[PDB]
Design a binder for this molecule. Structure first.
Ligand SMILES: [Mg+2]
Ligand SMILES: [Mg+2]
Ligand SMILES: [Mg+2]
Ligand SMILES: [Mg+2]
Ligand SMILES: [Mg+2]
Lengths: 58, 82, 137
RNA sequence: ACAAGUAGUCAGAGCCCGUUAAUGGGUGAUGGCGUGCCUUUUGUAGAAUGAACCGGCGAGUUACGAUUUGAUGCAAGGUUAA
RNA sequence: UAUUGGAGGUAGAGCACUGUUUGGACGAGGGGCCGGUUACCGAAUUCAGACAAACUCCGAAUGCCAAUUAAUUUAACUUGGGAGUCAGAACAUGGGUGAUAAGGUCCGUGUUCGAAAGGGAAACAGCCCAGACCACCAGCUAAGGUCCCAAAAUA
RNA sequence: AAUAGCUCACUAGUCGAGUGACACUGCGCCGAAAAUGUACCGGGGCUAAACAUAUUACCGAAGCUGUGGAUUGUCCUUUGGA
RNA sequence: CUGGGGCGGUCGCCUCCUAAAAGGUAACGGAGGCGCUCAAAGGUUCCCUCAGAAUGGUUGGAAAUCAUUCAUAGAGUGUAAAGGCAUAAGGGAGCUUGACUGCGAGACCUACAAGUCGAGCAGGGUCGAAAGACGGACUUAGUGAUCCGGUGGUUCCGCAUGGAAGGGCCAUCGCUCAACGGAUAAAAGCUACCCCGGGGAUAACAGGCUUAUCUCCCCCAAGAGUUCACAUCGACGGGGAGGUUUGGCACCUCGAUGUCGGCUCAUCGCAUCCUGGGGCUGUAGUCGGUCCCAAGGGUUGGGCUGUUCGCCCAUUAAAGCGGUA
RNA sequence: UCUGGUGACUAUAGCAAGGAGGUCACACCUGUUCCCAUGCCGAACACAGAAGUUAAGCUCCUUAGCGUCGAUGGUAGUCGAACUUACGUUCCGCUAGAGUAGAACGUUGCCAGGC
């Protein structure tokens, strides 16, 4: 339904792919966060860069 | 810097940017090259022609679709509804 | 089991030495066999040393099958030369091996004699080995 | 006057002083951190180069023409040169 | 990014082609001799094995091109004024070259340094973590750690 | 130099519980010699202060929060706050 | 250009692999070709299918030609290689000249200049009964801007007018620039008499990395040694240590790090030359050989060469091997 | 579904074998005078004819020898990650080739006569 995303790890030293994905999710700085609606399109991006972010059911 | 030792193979040509030039689904205008080749990796199909250089170009406007011919051969088509 | 009689291209890119035995992992001709557990080259000259040791130790007894053939040529540049100016000339023939690649097979001789012969072969050889019998069951 | 120091900073007792009065000035036992500056380089504490120290002097300006931007006249017209 | 559609022949496998190869069947040619016999030797034909950057009956992962299209983001292109750059470096990974040498050399693909301070690695441009607008004698953590030097478990 | 042959083929009995081999592994041992001074833990030192597998704390940055302050940009006008 | 120059090789085009399954991608990397050829080896219409193999035979060097069933093309395609090809793009045969003129929407490539592919539209054809196909060879190399000059057309320019000489445009030729984007399309050498501006961007010295070479150590144990692998010595092979040699790399030093021998002075390692302790032995003791522990000390004087080294003459208990720019 | 055209599909469509059948369609056949006919045959091609016969081509039916197709499970490889310097290890997606079970002696569109 709704899930909350936070960029726990940094983005320095990671490929431009993972940089642009993090930009697409709308996360700006380390430990920044956003709330978006559960959606296979969004899950595709979280799964691609799960090692930098974390999820919550909020 | 060594001396007299010399090799008889330091030569090559300029590669030709062959291969695909359009993809299934996009609107090509007529004349658009779809696949520059040698011999026939892909034969022309509907509304597609064969250049002198084995080049494949659309006859008319429309979408592009790659398909199978028989068992081990592929063709190309163009369809106009747009 | 020394050299290929002819090859098409005499100067070739060196072989990949990372992964597992594509095949030859079973005793097919003989009864007992010797497989490898690391992966080095074999230079068409250490297997020659090994088959001699085995054959002469069996006193012309049972049969032997060498399972590795030295196919790849290798190059070495002439001495005291700088870098560049082409590729060097062929110095020997090799055959890369992998962990699990059977190397030598024997039959028609008792088990202990075969194990001793393959032991003596193992020391003339640059790869850790293992004694194996014809897989059954 | 038992100490190992690119010489500062930061933390601080003790001792003297009192201002452009403000959460003040001088010195600093002792602790923490800390290899000048320029040039040139992939990279310089560099044992690469340059300067002993102070002071003065010491390097993208001007003429004409072209282009572009801003500005101002006024506009199917604008403008003079000798 | 999710979902469709497609070009291509790498990794891996495989021997159907070009070859490279180890054993075993099976009949036979010039020829041991008198066209000969038998050994063989040059192959034909099989069965089991294997090898390959310039082999492929096969064939991924991923990259790439595009969509009737979605969802999240915020760039993108055109014209004009001004440039600097053409000595790169190391790590990780796919390869050539060398000797499966070099802090080697030449490419591809990231990252970092260059042009990046801060914490860790004793010290240590390139490694790990992380990008410094300016205070504060506030708080939480990442990599690394918690007996003393030296903040934290002699858990 | 013929040979001198006891003991583990072999067990009653000295007497009475065990004893060959095999794999596949976890951690060590040997192989192991170089030049000013330990000198191949940063030092002390460590039988855990090593290693493995869990668990729970805490420290740790100029990262990220907290409070105050610049300076630009985009919004609301909350002409002020975001 | 160049793993410093020099010497050797190379320089433009096409094909293949390296190239990591789009495209692209480098090395003095691994392989080869081109500077043409075809008036049919072009266009079109209609026909036809191949190499080899045996069941084989007038020849039968074997297989020439001929025969017959299988032949996935294993053959041919003018040439290098790679993609293709029985729709045949392969092989005949008949007509033929499209190996057309004027162009081109659109795309590919790409810094530029160039290069590449084009449906279609006119003109006029050729082939075919017609539909239709044809702006060269199955595809991809066969080449070289620009100035200058020559030849043919066309004047539409041509100085007061007419005409001309000269130009312009359109064909086309002609350098030959192969160092193949071509410094005038005229041209080689030595400087130890050298000079200036630069560089550790780049060599000689040593420092650093590596350890191919080099010194030493080991492992396996055929074997020699009466017998006997293992007193000693150890082949074929295999694994290492060291950083003393010959090198490789080009990282500090060219606004200077004096380089070889000898002299003076040493200092440190031990893989020990003597001396001390031992295990051994194919050691009866003296003898020697081997291995282990050992670095405290000691470890000559001369002849010959600049020599280090090495040889030689006398001694000594020994006349050690290396690091230290 | 018979029968003949025609064409749509990756040979699940093919080859070999055995067996039928000629329902007037199909090939076989008689000949060269007739257009035509062949670098070189009435071979073919073309043509006039239909007296012979299904034998073969063709058609239909069987059979998996032969051909092709071919899972699941897995393994190799690898995208991303975390260790790491090992000819590596771990986790997570994706997921071959080979082989094994098996599918398979076709499905099918329009037309014309059939029944
Ligand atoms: Mg200085
Ligand atoms: Mg100094
Ligand atoms: Mg000075
Ligand atoms: Mg000078
Ligand atoms: Mg100086």
């Amino acid at each position: 339904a709704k899930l909350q995303i936070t960029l726990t790890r940094s983005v320095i030293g990671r490929p431009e792919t993972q940089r642009k994905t993090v930009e697409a999710l709308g996360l700006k700085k380390t430990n920044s966060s956003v709330v978006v609606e559960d959606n296979p399109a969004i899950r595709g991006q979280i799964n691609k860069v799960k090692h930098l972010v974390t999820v919550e059911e909020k | 810097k060594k001396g007299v030792s010399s090799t008889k193979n330091g030569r090559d040509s300029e590669s030709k940017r062959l291969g695909a030039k359009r993809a299934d689904g996009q609107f090509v205008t007529g004349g658009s090259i779809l696949y520059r080749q040698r011999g026939t990796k892909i034969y022309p199909g509907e509304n597609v022609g064969r250049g002198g250089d084995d080049t494949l170009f659309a006859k008319i406007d429309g979408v592009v679709k790659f398909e199978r011919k028989g068992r081990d051969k592929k063709q190309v088509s163009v369809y106009a509804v747009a | 089991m020394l050299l290929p009689k002819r090859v098409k291209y005499r100067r070739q890119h060196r072989p990949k030495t990372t992964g597992r035995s594509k095949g030859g992992n079973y005793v097919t001709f003989g009864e007992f066999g010797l497989q490898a557990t690391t992966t080095s080259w074999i230079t068409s000259r250490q297997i020659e040393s090994a088959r001699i040791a085995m054959t002469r130790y069996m006193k012309r007894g049972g049969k032997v099958w060498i399972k590795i053939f030295p196919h790849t040529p290798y190059t070495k540049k002439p001495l005291e030369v700088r870098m560049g100016a082409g590729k060097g000339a062929v110095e020997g023939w090799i055959a890369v091996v992998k962990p699990g690649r059977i190397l030598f097979e024997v039959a028609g001789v008792s088990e202990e004699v075969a194990r001793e012969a393959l032991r003596l072969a193992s020391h003339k050889l640059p790869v850790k080995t293992k004694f194996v019998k014809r897989e059954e069951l």
